[PDB]
Design an enzyme around this catalytic site. Sequence first.
Site, PDB file in Angstrom:
ATOM      1  N   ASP A 190       0.816  -1.210   0.000  1.00  0.00           N
ATOM      2  CA  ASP A 190       0.000   0.000   0.000  1.00  0.00           C
ATOM      3  C   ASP A 190       0.851   1.263   0.000  1.00  0.00           C
ATOM      4  O   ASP A 190       0.329   2.376  -0.042  1.00  0.00           O
ATOM      5  CB  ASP A 190      -0.952   0.010   1.196  1.00  0.00           C
ATOM      6  CG  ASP A 190      -2.284  -0.622   0.878  1.00  0.00           C
ATOM      7  OD1 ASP A 190      -2.644  -0.649  -0.313  1.00  0.00           O
ATOM      8  OD2 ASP A 190      -2.975  -1.082   1.808  1.00  0.00           O
ATOM      9  N   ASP A 214     -13.082  35.256 -33.921  1.00  0.00           N
ATOM     10  CA  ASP A 214     -12.590  33.906 -34.164  1.00  0.00           C
ATOM     11  C   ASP A 214     -13.226  32.898 -33.206  1.00  0.00           C
ATOM     12  O   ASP A 214     -12.973  31.697 -33.290  1.00  0.00           O
ATOM     13  CB  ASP A 214     -11.062  33.852 -34.104  1.00  0.00           C
ATOM     14  CG  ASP A 214     -10.522  33.790 -32.691  1.00  0.00           C
ATOM     15  OD1 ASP A 214     -11.120  34.398 -31.777  1.00  0.00           O
ATOM     16  OD2 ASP A 214      -9.475  33.135 -32.497  1.00  0.00           O
ATOM     17  N   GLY A 258     -10.760  27.240 -36.956  1.00  0.00           N
ATOM     18  CA  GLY A 258     -11.740  27.821 -37.861  1.00  0.00           C
ATOM     19  C   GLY A 258     -11.587  27.532 -39.342  1.00  0.00           C
ATOM     20  O   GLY A 258     -12.475  26.930 -39.948  1.00  0.00           O
ATOM     21  N   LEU A 259     -10.473  27.964 -39.928  1.00  0.00           N
ATOM     22  CA  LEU A 259     -10.259  27.808 -41.365  1.00  0.00           C
ATOM     23  C   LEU A 259     -10.273  26.350 -41.802  1.00  0.00           C
ATOM     24  O   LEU A 259     -10.907  26.001 -42.799  1.00  0.00           O
ATOM     25  CB  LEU A 259      -8.947  28.464 -41.803  1.00  0.00           C
ATOM     26  CG  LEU A 259      -8.570  28.254 -43.274  1.00  0.00           C
ATOM     27  CD1 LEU A 259      -9.655  28.785 -44.202  1.00  0.00           C
ATOM     28  CD2 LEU A 259      -7.233  28.901 -43.586  1.00  0.00           C
TER      29      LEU A 259
HETATM   30  C1  PMR Z   1      -3.158  37.188 -44.505  1.00  0.00           C
HETATM   31  C2  PMR Z   1      -3.747  37.661 -43.424  1.00  0.00           C
HETATM   32  C3  PMR Z   1      -4.566  36.782 -42.552  1.00  0.00           C
HETATM   33  C4  PMR Z   1      -4.444  36.586 -41.106  1.00  0.00           C
HETATM   34  C5  PMR Z   1      -3.460  37.185 -40.137  1.00  0.00           C
HETATM   35  C6  PMR Z   1      -5.554  35.622 -40.861  1.00  0.00           C
HETATM   36  C7  PMR Z   1      -5.830  35.102 -39.518  1.00  0.00           C
HETATM   37  C8  PMR Z   1      -6.971  34.276 -39.107  1.00  0.00           C
HETATM   38  N1  PMR Z   1      -7.860  33.738 -39.974  1.00  0.00           N
HETATM   39 MG1  PMR Z   1      -7.882  33.958 -42.023  1.00  0.00          MG
HETATM   40  N2  PMR Z   1      -6.282  35.244 -41.937  1.00  0.00           N
HETATM   41  C9  PMR Z   1      -5.715  35.936 -42.948  1.00  0.00           C
HETATM   42  C10 PMR Z   1      -6.172  35.839 -44.336  1.00  0.00           C
HETATM   43  C11 PMR Z   1      -7.270  35.014 -44.845  1.00  0.00           C
HETATM   44  N3  PMR Z   1      -8.026  34.226 -44.061  1.00  0.00           N
HETATM   45  C12 PMR Z   1      -8.903  33.685 -44.952  1.00  0.00           C
HETATM   46  C13 PMR Z   1      -9.972  32.742 -44.593  1.00  0.00           C
HETATM   47  C14 PMR Z   1     -10.319  32.373 -43.220  1.00  0.00           C
HETATM   48  C15 PMR Z   1     -11.476  31.526 -42.783  1.00  0.00           C
HETATM   49  C16 PMR Z   1     -12.636  30.787 -43.394  1.00  0.00           C
HETATM   50  C17 PMR Z   1     -11.251  31.539 -41.337  1.00  0.00           C
HETATM   51  C18 PMR Z   1     -10.155  32.268 -41.055  1.00  0.00           C
HETATM   52  C19 PMR Z   1      -9.900  32.287 -39.605  1.00  0.00           C
HETATM   53  C20 PMR Z   1      -8.714  33.072 -39.147  1.00  0.00           C
HETATM   54  C21 PMR Z   1      -8.385  33.143 -37.691  1.00  0.00           C
HETATM   55  C22 PMR Z   1      -9.031  32.554 -36.470  1.00  0.00           C
HETATM   56  C23 PMR Z   1      -8.190  31.353 -36.050  1.00  0.00           C
HETATM   57  C24 PMR Z   1      -8.666  30.115 -36.776  1.00  0.00           C
HETATM   58  O1  PMR Z   1      -9.597  29.454 -36.267  1.00  0.00           O
HETATM   59  O2  PMR Z   1      -8.122  29.791 -37.853  1.00  0.00           O
HETATM   60  C25 PMR Z   1      -7.181  33.974 -37.673  1.00  0.00           C
HETATM   61  C26 PMR Z   1      -6.369  34.411 -36.480  1.00  0.00           C
HETATM   62  C27 PMR Z   1     -11.008  31.481 -38.974  1.00  0.00           C
HETATM   63  C28 PMR Z   1     -11.883  32.402 -38.179  1.00  0.00           C
HETATM   64  O3  PMR Z   1     -12.421  32.037 -37.150  1.00  0.00           O
HETATM   65  O4  PMR Z   1     -12.120  33.761 -38.637  1.00  0.00           O
HETATM   66  C29 PMR Z   1     -12.980  34.629 -37.903  1.00  0.00           C
HETATM   67  C30 PMR Z   1     -11.834  30.993 -40.104  1.00  0.00           C
HETATM   68  O5  PMR Z   1     -12.889  30.266 -40.007  1.00  0.00           O
HETATM   69  N4  PMR Z   1      -9.548  32.795 -42.187  1.00  0.00           N
HETATM   70  C31 PMR Z   1      -8.737  34.081 -46.371  1.00  0.00           C
HETATM   71  C32 PMR Z   1      -9.603  33.603 -47.523  1.00  0.00           C
HETATM   72  C33 PMR Z   1      -8.946  33.635 -48.883  1.00  0.00           C
HETATM   73  C34 PMR Z   1      -7.598  35.020 -46.287  1.00  0.00           C
HETATM   74  C35 PMR Z   1      -6.877  35.816 -47.340  1.00  0.00           C
HETATM   75  S1  SF4 Z   2      -3.589  -6.302  -3.114  1.00  0.00           S
HETATM   76 FE1  SF4 Z   2      -4.730  -4.316  -2.848  1.00  0.00          FE
HETATM   77  S2  SF4 Z   2      -4.799  -3.949  -0.584  1.00  0.00           S
HETATM   78 FE2  SF4 Z   2      -3.160  -5.512  -1.003  1.00  0.00          FE
HETATM   79  S3  SF4 Z   2      -1.184  -4.338  -1.188  1.00  0.00           S
HETATM   80 FE3  SF4 Z   2      -2.049  -4.591  -3.300  1.00  0.00          FE
HETATM   81  S4  SF4 Z   2      -3.307  -2.705  -3.677  1.00  0.00           S
HETATM   82 FE4  SF4 Z   2      -2.942  -2.865  -1.418  1.00  0.00          FE
END
Ligand code: PMR
Ligand code: SF4
EC number: 1.3.7.7
Lengths: 488, 488, 417, 417
Positions: free
Chosen positions: B36, B277, B412-413
């Site tokens: 134990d 996001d 998300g994406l």
């Molecule tokens: C190039 C700049 C950039 C940055 C910093 C983000 C961050 C980001 N992009 Mg995105 N995103 C960028 C660009 C794009 N995103 C794009 C698409 C996209 C989608 C569908 C999603 C997304 C998301 C994100 C997110 C949230 C984190 C994630 O869940 O991916 C960040 C930080 C995510 C979200 O929740 O958006 C609100 C999500 O569903 N991005 C597109 C379409 C062509 C572009 C150009």
């Molecule tokens: S058999 Fe059970 S009660 Fe006995 S030493 Fe092992 S763990 Fe402890």
Amino acid sequence: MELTLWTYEGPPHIGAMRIATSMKGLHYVLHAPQGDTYADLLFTMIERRGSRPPVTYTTFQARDLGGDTAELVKGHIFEAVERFKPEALLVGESCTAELIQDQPGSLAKGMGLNIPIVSLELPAYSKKENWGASETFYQLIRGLLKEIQSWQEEGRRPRVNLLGPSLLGFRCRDDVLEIQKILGENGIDINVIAPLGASPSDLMRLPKADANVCLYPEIAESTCLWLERNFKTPFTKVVPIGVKATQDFLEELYELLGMEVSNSDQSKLPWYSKSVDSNYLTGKRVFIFGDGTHVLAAARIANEELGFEVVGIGTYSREMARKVRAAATELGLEALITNDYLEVEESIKECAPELVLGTQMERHSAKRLGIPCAVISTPMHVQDVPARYSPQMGWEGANVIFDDWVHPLMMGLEEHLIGMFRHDFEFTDGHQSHLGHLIHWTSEGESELAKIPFFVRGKVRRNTEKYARQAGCREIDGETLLDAKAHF
Amino acid sequence: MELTLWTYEGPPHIGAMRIATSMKGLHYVLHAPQGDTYADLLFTMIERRGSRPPVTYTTFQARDLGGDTAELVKGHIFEAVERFKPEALLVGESCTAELIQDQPGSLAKGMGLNIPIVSLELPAYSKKENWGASETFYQLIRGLLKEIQSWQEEGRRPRVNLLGPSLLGFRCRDDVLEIQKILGENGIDINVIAPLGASPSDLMRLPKADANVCLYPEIAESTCLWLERNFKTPFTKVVPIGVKATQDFLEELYELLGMEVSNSDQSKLPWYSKSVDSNYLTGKRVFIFGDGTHVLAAARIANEELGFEVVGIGTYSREMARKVRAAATELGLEALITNDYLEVEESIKECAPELVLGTQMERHSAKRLGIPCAVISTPMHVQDVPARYSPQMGWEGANVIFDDWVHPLMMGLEEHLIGMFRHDFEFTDGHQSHLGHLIHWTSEGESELAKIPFFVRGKVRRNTEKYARQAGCREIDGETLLDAKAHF
Amino acid sequence: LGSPEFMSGSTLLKETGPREVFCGLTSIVWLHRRMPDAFFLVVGSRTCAHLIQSAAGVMIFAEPRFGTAILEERDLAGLADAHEELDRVVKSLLKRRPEIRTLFLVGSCPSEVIKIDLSRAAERLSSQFNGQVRILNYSGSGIETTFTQGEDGALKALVPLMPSSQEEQLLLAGTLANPVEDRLKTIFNRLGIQKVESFPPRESTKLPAIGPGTKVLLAQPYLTDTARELKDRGAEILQAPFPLGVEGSQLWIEAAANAFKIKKTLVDATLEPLITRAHKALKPYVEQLSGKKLFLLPESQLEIPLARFLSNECGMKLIEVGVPYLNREMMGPELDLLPQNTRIVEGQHVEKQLDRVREHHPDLVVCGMGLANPLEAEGISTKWSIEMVFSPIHGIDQASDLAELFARPLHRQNLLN
Amino acid sequence: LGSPEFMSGSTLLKETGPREVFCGLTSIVWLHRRMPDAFFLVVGSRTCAHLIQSAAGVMIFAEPRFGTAILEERDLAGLADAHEELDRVVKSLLKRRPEIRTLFLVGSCPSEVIKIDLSRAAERLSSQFNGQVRILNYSGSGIETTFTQGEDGALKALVPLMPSSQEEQLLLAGTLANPVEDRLKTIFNRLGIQKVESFPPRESTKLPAIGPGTKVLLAQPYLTDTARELKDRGAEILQAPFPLGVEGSQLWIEAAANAFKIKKTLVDATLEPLITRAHKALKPYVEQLSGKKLFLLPESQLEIPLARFLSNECGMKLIEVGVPYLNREMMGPELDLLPQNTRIVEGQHVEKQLDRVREHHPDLVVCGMGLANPLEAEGISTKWSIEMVFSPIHGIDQASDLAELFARPLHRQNLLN
Ligand code: PMR
Ligand code: SF4
Ligand code: PMR
Ligand code: SF4
Ligand SMILES: [K+]
Ligand SMILES: [K+]
């Protein structure tokens, strides 16, 4: 042309935008084509900020090329200053605008504005993000302060500037907090934190500090050097990431301030790494990559604090090259200095490590190669801008580092069991349940190779082939694999 | 007999050991068979402590059953007191010792020791760990203090006891730190923290507090009740896990102390959850399980702070049953009150959630069912005793909670792309790259079912079959699946 | 804002100034997943490179699906031959990804300003392989294309590679989600139309044939050039509103049935159960959305059909409907369905447009992610515009899902407060 | 500590008092993985249940491989028939895991104290199925078994189920790692011994046959009862040291070759390259380990062979060699190899034994995980004892790996400081 599947840094104007946005009262007029406003998402989505970046883009289209694009940027400078009323103005170009050469910066200085104007000369085809941020930060401070021991005599606590931290920097939010906390416990006040949180007015107070703390050399080394030459302000060179590094940093700063006498157990990493469940961590093979600062920091931690064997090391920061090479030499390695993702991937593949400590881009190659990975440096994405307190620096930073760098590794008992029994229906080869998810080799030779417990199998295959070449050996068999093992 | 693949709690003597080890100057003589002593590893390996638990085990063998096992425990009581010289002594039995009934506790009180003796009566076959800890904590304090407004008049800051935190409790190390920090910022001092860090001498100071803070009711509710009856000390009942809960807790404690007037943005969770996001987090289906306190806390967070839909809820704490049932009723659910792992697994399987917020044991069922999981409560193992600062309580606790509860979810994406395109060679169905790893249905009916984007496919299949039964529908087809969707 | 114009009872304004939109390069983000056997190589700068990976690099890639040939100083100084450089880069790329079947050289602002002839490079490269890899070209530059216009470029580049045939065929042009594609095909087959194909396909090597006798339905409003090119090859471009919501989808489907002379009793017997169920499913979202004031910023050219659906079927009130571009002939059928006196703004001045948003304080602002969170901090609820391009929103059966996309942020607003 | 005894130049002491060891139940942790088609159901308390999952529950199980039938108040009060209860529990278990081929009812302190006849229950349950599930019984109770003695119980329970045969056969008894098993078999085949089988097997349903003509090599020192039971069925139990390191493995292999009358020139030509390479591989670890003072606490009965290997082949100095149990006849060959004047302690008083550790301050203390970290905090380096049961340590070729297990914590001590 340069084939680039993944770029480790953005263009230099991103670095400029990082300075302007990290600060307050500093606007940024950027001559750029329609579409470059994607940069806003770096701050609104990745940094999750509830405010638009202080950046006015001219956003020219193709139709504008047949017109007066110079007048276009002049109008936007007028609008930006009138609408936002900043303390100082950054004016610069994007890569495309750089082609048409409208000289927007010098134009701004001829428009009769009564605020300081920093004209940014960033070569988008030769320099990158961090250089851009360092250059912008340097010119702004040089421009503000150009025209222009004691603490013992005044009877006040020593005060230092924290230079370097910025948005789109790696965990700058919490590194600042941690270091500020630690300095206060050591009786050291903070004067100005810049660029992150500082105004142009704050930057004017930079000479008032007893010493400069250079937390992020990639961003603030040029500035600390300029501040030292012009105002005699000394600056720390030890970046406090890692227990030993934080101790050295404390000793260094004390000297520059002239104080006397930081204990090791203030972090929990030393005990955790000393404890018996870290025994099996000894000699685990790790590849390291990222910007200079974080690579150098990680290297000492992996080698002196965790007991890993660094089998590969490199950086994309060419300005940090000689230091990474020196560190690599101590580790008995050749440093990989490159911005070529394919070269990094190749180097990882060749040394076949058990763990990769790199950037967001190393996750790509680690996924393909099936290697446990952890992010230690920018480039990053949203996962590395967490809600919780997540410093890399100081005592608590080392705590975060221990948890995060050990996490991707298979755990003790499971790793032992997979080395013992290979015929399971659930706990198979390469399986990690704590992640919650379900020249010629003889047939004799590959059988002894499959015996090798996964993540170390890569190096074993390399060493055996190297051994077979190193001798008069032809083919390979089960015995020569055992011979290679005893040889190395 | 009760078939138990996984036990949510240990036997009650573990709870007793948790009290003795969390404290200082309190030794524990445990009548138990050889073997134990595994319990030591709970503290030396999971809690990673650099000291042996203050527990003396008699460790009897089969050969001892033919001898004087009563004399055996008497000798160990002598040795333990002589060698360790504690302020007070716990004496108790394990499950096996409970059979042979040597009455070791009453024996101890007849041995002429001149220190307080707590004789533990823990029914190992009827009660469990948390009851054991609560009973031990209660008897020790009742035994110490039995024989035995103001702060405004004294001109001092209000002072409270923090009752509940313990080793093998969930993130007690940091919860204490966070709450102590928050109270100090609200001008409220700490009197005695117990059992964690307290001596029997400290426990004597318990009436000196202006109010008792009951952080962990499973451990300290009986005690707070006893302290209230005997010393008029009022105690808080709101456990501060979650932003709103921490606010309510602050308002409650202020009333008990008689203060006047905690802002929401002191945590980052509200902004993170409000940010765009987190839009897609709305309505994600979550199952919740664990001890009463953490289940109740998680329920409000999931429902009021994150925007999840709680589709299943339960606890193994029977003493917390009526509260979990009340909370479940508000959520329109029936609470699962059980210690049967197979019942929990079954309930998860039936409601097919997109996320499971449970104990270490829920990882087992989530792995089998392929559901994203996160641990919110004991039972736990070593991963949940991290080096870094990891509270669940207060402002920062909510930050940790946001990161950890959202992490297992597909991002998300990627989630959008998998709903759009299902024919990829790498980004397949059920794949999450951010984790870095590579009655009758017609053929027409299952085709429309495969269209459903993974983690929600489980509920869709259930709802369609429920719909088909709910009507005169026979078989199932592509249209009745679309009918079921519009029906719910 | 200049002097207004009036079409179909609605008002058409134009605004010039600072824009906040994506360049056409961003089309790669969805296109690389619609056609996994294709690679998208941008010829541009580090800015272009940074754009794509900041978008798609949140996901982890074992195998690269896109990249950038970054112009160097020697390229700008003309010290290296652009065509030799392209050939070398494309060479070493096909080494890393030898399974690429179609390579897109995507033009950018830098490549288009200095006019690197990528189209001829694409032709020459196609010649040097021709049995293995197809190499094509389209422009995604910001100076020329906005967001979804990049897809128009990509599809237009595939058109000359479509086989020639005079067969019966209903072509659905524009990116559809896989299950939406399958659903629409199933419905179209119920009407008696046996030949229904999608453009783009799921594999770049398997392009649908084209010619006279091909009726083309446009599922996306941003295929101006692609439609024109499809018409140049003999196909008939059917005019109809876009398949968003019950109304739009019904008329869209009817357009094809009319062209194929399908009997109205058949198309009614087929669409009736779908429509009735859709009206049922829409109700809780209509309850959430009816009476809400809507404001859409220019992004994708989806704004007009979305506004039409949200007002006609969900009962929202339209404050301003912004589009980055307005093909008036193509939006014709859609403009007829819009409620009278709809305020439509082509182009943008983001600062002035923001002022209009702030002064109205809409219930829901459809905007980009450069404005979404900042607007939330000002106490203005948003619906991030990009989502509609990455959601299954087309068809009678997807009406409720489309409405849910806009009901969701409002619902969340309530849950959190 | 009582009056000493003397055997093979070595000193044998016995100590009584508080013990810190695992009960035999812990055998499940390694046995369930050696034989994945078997399930281990403990009949005991919540303490027993808590033990196993605190050990193995750090891993995540989609499918349960072990469990506990926890005795309730009614069981202790005799208000429920134990045999009816067992049957019901085993019933509902085979519902959750219908693929179980062999079920082990493992005795615990509670079940053994009140003497629930699990053996008869196992017999009766086996009868009620007999075509599908085998149900067996062994005791893992703390009062009766220490740690690895649990395996002795498990193997002994399989012995009656071994087929009867008088064939040529070399039986390797005791848990071997898979690659070690394969390696030893390969070597044994080189000597001309064609029939070599392992006990336990990898599948519980596929037990090796036994009878006269079967030579048994014991790979593990804790198979006292299993060896006795194997001998009762006609097999010859060869006497030899245990295959740890070069010396032990060589003599162990020679024992079988001698019994099969293999020519010495053949066994030398086969073992020579293995031995030479092993001596080469051992050198860097010997450099680390030579001259180091060693102290081993009782845990597994591996302590004597480990001490023999670490002193003879790695040059460590032995302070005290503790064992939880000492079968003197079985350790005979091993005791002859030990250096003169070795101090061996059978049994334990953990507090007094700790004092001996502290007063000596050894370079390396082999101990359990209840003492490992606390000793580290006192500045005493440890080697956690459990590892040897979960490592591939047997055979000539594994000598260097075995040494590395002890060199590792010392190496780490240097790296960190
Ligand atoms: C190039 C700049 C950039 C940055 C910093 C983000 C961050 C980001 N992009 Mg995105 N995103 C960028 C660009 C794009 N995103 C794009 C698409 C996209 C989608 C569908 C999603 C997304 C998301 C994100 C997110 C949230 C984190 C994630 O869940 O991916 C960040 C930080 C995510 C979200 O929740 O958006 C609100 C999500 O569903 N991005 C597109 C379409 C062509 C572009 C150009
Ligand atoms: S058999 Fe059970 S009660 Fe006995 S030493 Fe092992 S763990 Fe402890
Ligand atoms: C029942 C008590 C208990 C606890 C709290 C732990 C924790 C633990 N056991 Mg384990 N372990 C326990 C029991 C056992 N362990 C056992 C085995 C074992 C091995 C091989 C290992 C291990 C480990 C652990 C560890 C380290 C975390 C890990 O990597 O698993 C904890 C906290 C792990 C290690 O690094 O040990 C130093 C490792 O390699 N345990 C066995 C063998 C039958 C038993 C009974
Ligand atoms: S194509 Fe133009 S707008 Fe797009 S990222 Fe490149 S430079 Fe920017
Ligand atoms: K470069
Ligand atoms: K129970």
